[PDB]
Amino acid sequence: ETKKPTFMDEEVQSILTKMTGLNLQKTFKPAIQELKPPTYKLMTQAQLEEATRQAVEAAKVRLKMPPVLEERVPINDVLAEDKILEGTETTKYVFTDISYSIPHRERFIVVREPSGTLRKASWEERDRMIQVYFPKEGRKILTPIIFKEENLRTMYSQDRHVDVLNLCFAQFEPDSTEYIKVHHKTYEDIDKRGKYDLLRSTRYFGGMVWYFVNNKKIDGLLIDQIQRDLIDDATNLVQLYHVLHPDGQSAQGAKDQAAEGINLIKVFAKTEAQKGAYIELTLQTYQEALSRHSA
Amino acid sequence: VRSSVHARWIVGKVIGTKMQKTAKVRVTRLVLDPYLLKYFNKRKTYFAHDALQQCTVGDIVLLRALPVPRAKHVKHELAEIVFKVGKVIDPVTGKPCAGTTYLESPLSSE
Amino acid sequence: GKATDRMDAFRKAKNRAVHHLHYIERYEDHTIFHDISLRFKRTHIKMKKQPKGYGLRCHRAIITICRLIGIKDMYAKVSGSINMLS
Amino acid sequence: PMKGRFPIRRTLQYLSQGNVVFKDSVKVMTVNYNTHGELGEGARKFVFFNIPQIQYKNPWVQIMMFKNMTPSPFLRFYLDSGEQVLVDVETKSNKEIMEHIRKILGKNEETLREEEEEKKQLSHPANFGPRKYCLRECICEVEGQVPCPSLVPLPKEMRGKYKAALKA
RNA sequence: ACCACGAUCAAAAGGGACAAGCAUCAAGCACGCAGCAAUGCAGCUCAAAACGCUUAGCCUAGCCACACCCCCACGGGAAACAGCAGU
Ligand code: FES
Ligand SMILES: [K+]
Ligand SMILES: [Mg+2]
Ligand SMILES: [Mg+2]
Ligand SMILES: [Mg+2]
Ligand SMILES: [Mg+2]
Ligand SMILES: [Mg+2]
Ligand SMILES: [Mg+2]
Ligand SMILES: [Mg+2]
Ligand SMILES: [Mg+2]
């Protein structure tokens, strides 16, 4: 009938890509690593514009948003219950099919329990066995302690939210419970302190916006965009909000009033926005500075 | 098509015709000098069966491997004379030439 | 500096050197602008531009002179005659 | 310095920059070129710059050169089936010659990508053995598993010196 | 299991490739080819190192060689740890 868009829809990806922005200086920040002597080229004005164009293309690949997945369902499937083996072993066996050309989500990984049961391995056992035999660079078999609540607050105090998301992406799977828990705790810390600029020009901004829109908490990000003269982004944020909440007070108000442009932010600020008063004030200040520049 | 001979097709220069129905052919290959990383010619001798005794010392020939060696050192046969000595036919135009000069102009037959 | 006494030679040398000063261009105030390869008489010197943190990996006399110039990162190799003045 | 003109040719980096990898049918490649003449200039640069790169990527293909045997330069390839491929190169540059032979007798980028993948199957990450062949030598290197006794002494209960002592 | 007109593994045989030093080792001396055969031709290798002397286990997931000596082992000399421990 009428399906609500997904994160990977072409319309949603285009909106979130523009809201993210593309800053070559931040996307290609100098990395602290083993260095080599740089090379030099003599370029005309046209060759330089072409080299800058290729850098923008390489940046749009680096800003590719990871897909937002729902939490995976636990695995609980018994293949056999060989009761004759009960009490013959004290430790369980973990059998991993290491056939090279098989997707990791299609590999059979089973466990023979001391009770004689042959069951499929759980998601946590799977990702651990896959790292044992197919070690991925940046991933650890034992969960690093950085992901403890006490150590994440230290990372947030230093405004290293992107590092937390880079660590989480390398350690956990996108549909894992640990992955979703860490991403949501990082998004919530950014919303509480208004640190939305830390994720701009990164591949994690779209996932953060997707989280605020679904949980109906875009007031903070909307205020941040107006204070930075990003009304084109602030207007798309309200439109994306109406698209994902069609049967809402704001979405209807925009239809009844045929609101467009800045008018959408006013309709949203009065109906569904929780900080409606602070949005009208922040929006009023913007229109003033825009009039002074016009005059 | 199978054959127990290693070198299936090779081009070489005839350097001897003193054996009956056998042409002695010098074959050169480029071999990389590992230290200098420069290619140098490495030559090897092959005996080729020439049933019609049509090979002349100095002509360039194409050798085809035999299914099995017909003698201790005869593992190939004359498949084609590429460049007859002193009687070259330009493959690009099909006209006879003497070095870098035509003996019959390509314009003769249009 | 030349003199019968060593301290007199020290005085002459350092007082004269300050009147024969070069100016050395430095890339980002820590290395040279490009690889330098030259021969002076029979002494060969090959210098390489290096990134930050590389340090001075050079003949000990070149290290001393680099610290006076203000070069922090460079590689140098000396071949042929190792004549200090050359 | 390195001897000769264009010493870059005598470096492994330059030799590996060849993009011509002949199909399995190519067995011999003869090169007929002239030492003098403006119309044979591209063929001379081809012999000077590219033949080393071709031979490096095709070590088992015989390459033989011939000087001043005909009025114009040309390449000729001899295939395993007995077919011969004549390529007229007069007036062409050495780059146009390399692009031509790559199109008619070179393996495409797809065929080469596949071959590289079939090689990666020979070094399975899950296998244990010497560093020359495997990433890890022993399972004790995997975090969480019982470490090597040479680094962390095993508990007395897991050692035969004290298992037999108690049992005996 | 048995046949596998197959796969795997791998001899013998054929082709190719494959250590170091000495050229004051420069020639080797039958080392080739044709023919169904009879037999005919006189060729074959070599300074791009033949032929020869000397040294050495090797290219190490391991491989090669040897197994008291006479390269071999009918035979002979002779009576065997280069399996472990030991002298
Ligand atoms: S090397 Fe793994 S137990 Fe010793
Ligand atoms: K023996
Ligand atoms: Mg064999
Ligand atoms: Mg000599
Ligand atoms: Mg002597
Ligand atoms: Mg020898
Ligand atoms: Mg020995
Ligand atoms: Mg003994
Ligand atoms: Mg014996
Ligand atoms: Mg013993």
Short mmCIF file of N, CA, C and O (backbone and C1' of nucleotides) in Angstrom, two decimals, chain E residues 15-64:
data_model
loop_
_atom_site.label_atom_id
_atom_site.label_comp_id
_atom_site.label_asym_id
_atom_site.label_seq_id
_atom_site.Cartn_x
_atom_site.Cartn_y
_atom_site.Cartn_z
P G E 15 65.47 -37.57 -24.05
"O5'" G E 15 64.62 -36.23 -23.99
"C5'" G E 15 64.08 -35.66 -25.18
"C4'" G E 15 63.26 -34.43 -24.89
"C3'" G E 15 63.93 -33.35 -24.06
"O3'" G E 15 64.85 -32.56 -24.79
"C1'" G E 15 61.75 -33.71 -23.25
P G E 16 66.17 -32.00 -24.06
"O5'" G E 16 65.62 -30.89 -23.06
"C5'" G E 16 64.96 -29.73 -23.56
"C4'" G E 16 64.33 -28.92 -22.46
"C3'" G E 16 65.25 -28.41 -21.36
"O3'" G E 16 66.03 -27.29 -21.74
"C1'" G E 16 63.29 -29.28 -20.39
P A E 17 67.49 -27.07 -21.11
"O5'" A E 17 67.22 -26.68 -19.60
"C5'" A E 17 66.54 -25.48 -19.27
"C4'" A E 17 66.14 -25.42 -17.82
"C3'" A E 17 67.28 -25.48 -16.81
"O3'" A E 17 67.93 -24.23 -16.64
"C1'" A E 17 65.57 -26.96 -16.14
P C E 18 69.52 -24.18 -16.39
"O5'" C E 18 69.70 -24.78 -14.93
"C5'" C E 18 69.10 -24.16 -13.80
"C4'" C E 18 69.25 -25.00 -12.56
"C3'" C E 18 70.66 -25.46 -12.23
"O3'" C E 18 71.43 -24.46 -11.59
"C1'" C E 18 69.17 -27.28 -12.03
P A E 19 72.98 -24.25 -11.98
"O5'" A E 19 73.71 -24.01 -10.59
"C5'" A E 19 73.87 -25.08 -9.67
"C4'" A E 19 74.57 -24.63 -8.41
"C3'" A E 19 75.96 -24.06 -8.59
"O3'" A E 19 75.96 -22.69 -8.96
"C1'" A E 19 76.00 -25.67 -6.87
P A E 20 77.18 -22.07 -9.80
"O5'" A E 20 78.39 -22.06 -8.77
"C5'" A E 20 78.34 -21.29 -7.59
"C4'" A E 20 79.54 -21.54 -6.71
"C3'" A E 20 80.90 -21.34 -7.37
"O3'" A E 20 81.29 -19.98 -7.43
"C1'" A E 20 80.89 -23.38 -6.17
P G E 21 82.13 -19.44 -8.69
"O5'" G E 21 83.60 -20.00 -8.43
"C5'" G E 21 84.34 -19.59 -7.29
"C4'" G E 21 85.63 -20.35 -7.16
"C3'" G E 21 86.51 -20.39 -8.40
"O3'" G E 21 87.28 -19.21 -8.57
"C1'" G E 21 86.35 -22.56 -7.49
P C E 22 87.63 -18.68 -10.05
"O5'" C E 22 88.68 -19.75 -10.59
"C5'" C E 22 89.96 -19.88 -10.00
"C4'" C E 22 90.74 -21.01 -10.61
"C3'" C E 22 90.82 -21.03 -12.13
"O3'" C E 22 91.78 -20.14 -12.65
"C1'" C E 22 90.28 -23.19 -11.33
P A E 23 91.40 -19.14 -13.86
"O5'" A E 23 91.33 -20.08 -15.14
"C5'" A E 23 92.30 -21.10 -15.34
"C4'" A E 23 92.57 -21.37 -16.81
"C3'" A E 23 92.57 -20.15 -17.73
"O3'" A E 23 93.59 -20.31 -18.73
"C1'" A E 23 91.05 -21.74 -18.54
P U E 24 95.07 -19.74 -18.49
"O5'" U E 24 95.80 -20.87 -17.66
"C5'" U E 24 95.80 -22.23 -18.10
"C4'" U E 24 96.41 -23.14 -17.06
"C3'" U E 24 95.95 -22.90 -15.63
"O3'" U E 24 95.94 -24.13 -14.91
"C1'" U E 24 98.27 -22.59 -15.76
P C E 25 94.57 -24.79 -14.41
"O5'" C E 25 94.14 -25.73 -15.62
"C5'" C E 25 94.91 -26.86 -15.98
"C4'" C E 25 94.13 -27.79 -16.87
"C3'" C E 25 93.79 -27.25 -18.25
"O3'" C E 25 94.85 -27.41 -19.18
"C1'" C E 25 91.86 -28.20 -17.26
P A E 26 95.07 -26.37 -20.38
"O5'" A E 26 94.59 -27.17 -21.68
"C5'" A E 26 93.21 -27.29 -21.99
"C4'" A E 26 92.96 -27.22 -23.48
"C3'" A E 26 93.77 -26.16 -24.23
"O3'" A E 26 93.97 -26.58 -25.58
"C1'" A E 26 91.49 -25.70 -24.48
P A E 27 95.15 -27.58 -26.00
"O5'" A E 27 94.67 -28.14 -27.41
"C5'" A E 27 93.93 -29.35 -27.52
"C4'" A E 27 92.65 -29.32 -26.72
"C3'" A E 27 91.84 -30.61 -26.71
"O3'" A E 27 92.35 -31.59 -25.83
"C1'" A E 27 90.39 -28.79 -27.11
P G E 28 92.43 -33.12 -26.29
"O5'" G E 28 90.95 -33.66 -26.07
"C5'" G E 28 90.33 -33.59 -24.80
"C4'" G E 28 88.87 -33.98 -24.86
"C3'" G E 28 88.57 -35.36 -25.43
"O3'" G E 28 88.75 -36.40 -24.48
"C1'" G E 28 87.07 -33.75 -26.34
P C E 29 89.80 -37.59 -24.76
"O5'" C E 29 89.15 -38.40 -25.97
"C5'" C E 29 87.82 -38.89 -25.90
"C4'" C E 29 87.30 -39.27 -27.27
"C3'" C E 29 88.03 -40.44 -27.93
"O3'" C E 29 87.12 -41.16 -28.76
"C1'" C E 29 88.29 -38.50 -29.25
P A E 30 86.46 -42.53 -28.24
"O5'" A E 30 85.02 -42.54 -28.93
"C5'" A E 30 83.97 -41.71 -28.45
"C4'" A E 30 82.86 -41.57 -29.46
"C3'" A E 30 82.41 -42.87 -30.12
"O3'" A E 30 81.01 -42.81 -30.38
"C1'" A E 30 83.18 -41.37 -31.77
P C E 31 79.95 -43.14 -29.22
"O5'" C E 31 79.81 -41.77 -28.42
"C5'" C E 31 79.12 -40.66 -28.98
"C4'" C E 31 79.55 -39.36 -28.34
"C3'" C E 31 79.07 -38.08 -29.02
"O3'" C E 31 77.80 -37.67 -28.56
"C1'" C E 31 81.40 -37.93 -28.48
P G E 32 76.44 -38.13 -29.28
"O5'" G E 32 76.68 -37.89 -30.83
"C5'" G E 32 75.74 -38.37 -31.78
"C4'" G E 32 75.64 -37.48 -32.99
"C3'" G E 32 74.49 -37.80 -33.95
"O3'" G E 32 73.25 -37.26 -33.54
"C1'" G E 32 76.49 -37.59 -35.18
P C E 33 71.90 -38.11 -33.74
"O5'" C E 33 71.65 -38.05 -35.31
"C5'" C E 33 71.40 -36.81 -35.96
"C4'" C E 33 71.52 -36.91 -37.46
"C3'" C E 33 70.61 -37.91 -38.15
"O3'" C E 33 69.28 -37.46 -38.30
"C1'" C E 33 72.79 -38.14 -39.00
P A E 34 68.07 -38.52 -38.32
"O5'" A E 34 68.18 -39.19 -39.76
"C5'" A E 34 67.97 -38.43 -40.94
"C4'" A E 34 68.37 -39.19 -42.17
"C3'" A E 34 67.63 -40.50 -42.42
"O3'" A E 34 66.34 -40.31 -42.99
"C1'" A E 34 69.94 -40.84 -42.74
P G E 35 65.11 -41.20 -42.49
"O5'" G E 35 65.44 -42.66 -43.05
"C5'" G E 35 65.58 -42.89 -44.44
"C4'" G E 35 66.03 -44.30 -44.73
"C3'" G E 35 65.28 -45.40 -44.00
"O3'" G E 35 64.02 -45.71 -44.57
"C1'" G E 35 67.60 -45.80 -43.86
P C E 36 62.77 -46.02 -43.62
"O5'" C E 36 63.22 -47.32 -42.80
"C5'" C E 36 62.54 -47.71 -41.62
"C4'" C E 36 62.45 -49.21 -41.51
"C3'" C E 36 63.78 -49.97 -41.53
"O3'" C E 36 64.42 -49.99 -40.26
"C1'" C E 36 62.26 -51.00 -43.01
P A E 37 65.98 -49.62 -40.13
"O5'" A E 37 66.74 -50.86 -40.78
"C5'" A E 37 66.71 -52.14 -40.17
"C4'" A E 37 66.97 -53.24 -41.18
"C3'" A E 37 68.38 -53.31 -41.75
"O3'" A E 37 69.28 -54.01 -40.92
"C1'" A E 37 66.80 -53.40 -43.51
P A E 38 70.82 -53.57 -40.81
"O5'" A E 38 71.43 -53.91 -42.24
"C5'" A E 38 71.65 -55.25 -42.64
"C4'" A E 38 71.94 -55.34 -44.12
"C3'" A E 38 73.15 -54.57 -44.61
"O3'" A E 38 74.37 -55.27 -44.43
"C1'" A E 38 71.31 -54.05 -45.98
P U E 39 75.53 -54.67 -43.49
"O5'" U E 39 75.82 -53.23 -44.09
"C5'" U E 39 76.29 -53.07 -45.42
"C4'" U E 39 75.67 -51.88 -46.09
"C3'" U E 39 76.41 -50.55 -45.93
"O3'" U E 39 77.50 -50.40 -46.82
"C1'" U E 39 74.11 -50.23 -45.49
P G E 40 78.65 -49.32 -46.51
"O5'" G E 40 77.95 -47.92 -46.79
"C5'" G E 40 77.57 -47.54 -48.10
"C4'" G E 40 76.81 -46.24 -48.12
"C3'" G E 40 77.56 -45.01 -47.62
"O3'" G E 40 78.42 -44.45 -48.60
"C1'" G E 40 75.41 -45.08 -46.64
P C E 41 79.78 -43.72 -48.16
"O5'" C E 41 79.29 -42.36 -47.50
"C5'" C E 41 78.67 -41.35 -48.28
"C4'" C E 41 78.10 -40.25 -47.42
"C3'" C E 41 79.08 -39.53 -46.50
"O3'" C E 41 79.83 -38.53 -47.16
"C1'" C E 41 77.14 -40.11 -45.28
P A E 42 81.35 -38.24 -46.72
"O5'" A E 42 81.24 -37.82 -45.19
"C5'" A E 42 80.54 -36.64 -44.80
"C4'" A E 42 80.71 -36.36 -43.33
"C3'" A E 42 82.15 -36.13 -42.87
"O3'" A E 42 82.19 -35.18 -41.81
"C1'" A E 42 81.22 -37.92 -41.67
P G E 43 81.99 -33.61 -42.07
"O5'" G E 43 81.00 -33.17 -40.91
"C5'" G E 43 79.60 -33.23 -41.08
"C4'" G E 43 78.93 -34.17 -40.11
"C3'" G E 43 78.81 -33.69 -38.68
"O3'" G E 43 77.76 -32.76 -38.49
"C1'" G E 43 79.53 -35.94 -38.70
P C E 44 77.94 -31.54 -37.46
"O5'" C E 44 77.89 -32.23 -36.03
"C5'" C E 44 76.74 -32.94 -35.59
"C4'" C E 44 76.95 -33.49 -34.20
"C3'" C E 44 77.49 -32.50 -33.18
"O3'" C E 44 76.47 -31.68 -32.63
"C1'" C E 44 78.73 -34.51 -33.07
P U E 45 76.79 -30.15 -32.27
"O5'" U E 45 77.68 -30.23 -30.96
"C5'" U E 45 77.15 -30.78 -29.75
"C4'" U E 45 78.16 -30.70 -28.63
"C3'" U E 45 78.86 -29.36 -28.47
"O3'" U E 45 78.08 -28.41 -27.77
"C1'" U E 45 80.45 -31.11 -28.39
P C E 46 78.10 -26.86 -28.21
"O5'" C E 46 79.53 -26.35 -27.74
"C5'" C E 46 79.95 -26.51 -26.40
"C4'" C E 46 81.42 -26.23 -26.23
"C3'" C E 46 81.93 -24.95 -26.87
"O3'" C E 46 81.65 -23.80 -26.10
"C1'" C E 46 83.42 -26.73 -27.35
P A E 47 81.18 -22.44 -26.80
"O5'" A E 47 81.94 -21.31 -25.96
"C5'" A E 47 83.31 -21.48 -25.62
"C4'" A E 47 83.84 -20.28 -24.89
"C3'" A E 47 83.93 -19.00 -25.71
"O3'" A E 47 83.76 -17.87 -24.86
"C1'" A E 47 86.10 -19.64 -25.04
P A E 48 82.56 -16.83 -25.09
"O5'" A E 48 81.26 -17.63 -24.64
"C5'" A E 48 80.91 -17.76 -23.27
"C4'" A E 48 79.53 -18.34 -23.12
"C3'" A E 48 79.33 -19.67 -23.84
"O3'" A E 48 78.34 -20.44 -23.16
"C1'" A E 48 77.96 -18.02 -24.84
P A E 49 78.70 -21.22 -21.80
"O5'" A E 49 80.18 -21.77 -22.06
"C5'" A E 49 80.41 -22.90 -22.90
"C4'" A E 49 81.66 -23.64 -22.49
"C3'" A E 49 81.70 -24.10 -21.04
"O3'" A E 49 82.38 -25.34 -20.93
"C1'" A E 49 83.50 -22.62 -21.46
P A E 50 81.95 -26.41 -19.80
"O5'" A E 50 81.75 -27.77 -20.61
"C5'" A E 50 80.65 -27.94 -21.49
"C4'" A E 50 81.06 -28.73 -22.71
"C3'" A E 50 81.83 -30.01 -22.44
"O3'" A E 50 80.99 -31.12 -22.17
"C1'" A E 50 82.97 -28.73 -24.07
P C E 51 81.27 -32.06 -20.89
"O5'" C E 51 82.79 -32.49 -21.03
"C5'" C E 51 83.20 -33.46 -21.98
"C4'" C E 51 84.70 -33.62 -21.99
"C3'" C E 51 85.34 -33.87 -20.64
"O3'" C E 51 85.29 -35.22 -20.22
"C1'" C E 51 86.50 -32.13 -21.73
P G E 52 84.99 -35.58 -18.68
"O5'" G E 52 86.17 -34.88 -17.87
"C5'" G E 52 87.50 -35.37 -17.98
"C4'" G E 52 88.52 -34.42 -17.39
"C3'" G E 52 88.50 -34.26 -15.88
"O3'" G E 52 89.10 -35.34 -15.19
"C1'" G E 52 88.79 -32.15 -16.92
P C E 53 88.59 -35.76 -13.73
"O5'" C E 53 89.29 -34.72 -12.75
"C5'" C E 53 90.70 -34.73 -12.57
"C4'" C E 53 91.17 -33.52 -11.80
"C3'" C E 53 90.57 -33.32 -10.42
"O3'" C E 53 91.17 -34.13 -9.42
"C1'" C E 53 90.52 -31.28 -11.59
P U E 54 90.30 -34.64 -8.17
"O5'" U E 54 90.04 -33.32 -7.32
"C5'" U E 54 91.12 -32.62 -6.71
"C4'" U E 54 90.69 -31.29 -6.17
"C3'" U E 54 89.55 -31.30 -5.16
"O3'" U E 54 89.97 -31.66 -3.85
"C1'" U E 54 89.16 -29.61 -6.75
P U E 55 88.94 -32.38 -2.85
"O5'" U E 55 87.88 -31.24 -2.49
"C5'" U E 55 88.29 -30.07 -1.81
"C4'" U E 55 87.15 -29.09 -1.63
"C3'" U E 55 85.88 -29.64 -1.01
"O3'" U E 55 85.95 -29.76 0.39
"C1'" U E 55 85.34 -28.29 -2.88
P A E 56 85.13 -30.92 1.14
"O5'" A E 56 83.61 -30.48 0.98
"C5'" A E 56 83.16 -29.25 1.50
"C4'" A E 56 81.75 -28.93 1.06
"C3'" A E 56 80.72 -30.02 1.26
"O3'" A E 56 80.25 -30.10 2.60
"C1'" A E 56 80.47 -29.09 -0.90
P G E 57 80.05 -31.53 3.31
"O5'" G E 57 78.65 -32.04 2.75
"C5'" G E 57 77.52 -31.17 2.70
"C4'" G E 57 76.64 -31.49 1.52
"C3'" G E 57 75.54 -30.48 1.22
"O3'" G E 57 76.00 -29.37 0.49
"C1'" G E 57 74.63 -32.66 1.22
P C E 58 75.41 -27.90 0.78
"O5'" C E 58 73.99 -27.91 0.06
"C5'" C E 58 73.88 -28.10 -1.35
"C4'" C E 58 72.45 -28.25 -1.78
"C3'" C E 58 71.51 -27.11 -1.39
"O3'" C E 58 71.59 -26.01 -2.29
"C1'" C E 58 70.50 -29.18 -0.85
P C E 59 71.33 -24.52 -1.78
"O5'" C E 59 69.74 -24.37 -1.81
"C5'" C E 59 69.11 -23.14 -1.49
"C4'" C E 59 67.61 -23.21 -1.68
"C3'" C E 59 66.91 -24.33 -0.91
"O3'" C E 59 65.62 -23.89 -0.51
"C1'" C E 59 66.52 -24.59 -3.22
P U E 60 65.31 -23.60 1.04
"O5'" U E 60 65.30 -25.04 1.71
"C5'" U E 60 64.30 -25.99 1.38
"C4'" U E 60 63.65 -26.58 2.61
"C3'" U E 60 62.99 -25.56 3.54
"O3'" U E 60 61.84 -26.15 4.16
"C1'" U E 60 64.69 -26.70 4.71
P A E 61 60.39 -26.00 3.49
"O5'" A E 61 59.41 -26.64 4.56
"C5'" A E 61 59.54 -26.33 5.95
"C4'" A E 61 58.47 -27.01 6.77
"C3'" A E 61 58.32 -28.50 6.52
"O3'" A E 61 58.00 -29.18 7.73
"C1'" A E 61 56.28 -27.40 6.04
P G E 62 58.70 -30.59 8.06
"O5'" G E 62 58.24 -31.53 6.86
"C5'" G E 62 59.18 -32.34 6.16
"C4'" G E 62 59.42 -31.81 4.76
"C3'" G E 62 60.33 -32.66 3.88
"O3'" G E 62 59.66 -33.73 3.25
"C1'" G E 62 61.05 -30.42 3.81
P C E 63 60.42 -35.11 2.95
"O5'" C E 63 61.40 -34.76 1.74
"C5'" C E 63 60.89 -34.27 0.50
"C4'" C E 63 62.01 -33.80 -0.39
"C3'" C E 63 63.09 -34.84 -0.70
"O3'" C E 63 62.73 -35.70 -1.77
"C1'" C E 63 64.11 -32.82 -0.01
P C E 64 63.23 -37.22 -1.78
"O5'" C E 64 64.78 -37.13 -2.14
"C5'" C E 64 65.20 -36.61 -3.39
"C4'" C E 64 66.70 -36.45 -3.44
"C3'" C E 64 67.52 -37.69 -3.11
"O3'" C E 64 67.66 -38.56 -4.22
"C1'" C E 64 68.36 -35.85 -1.89
#
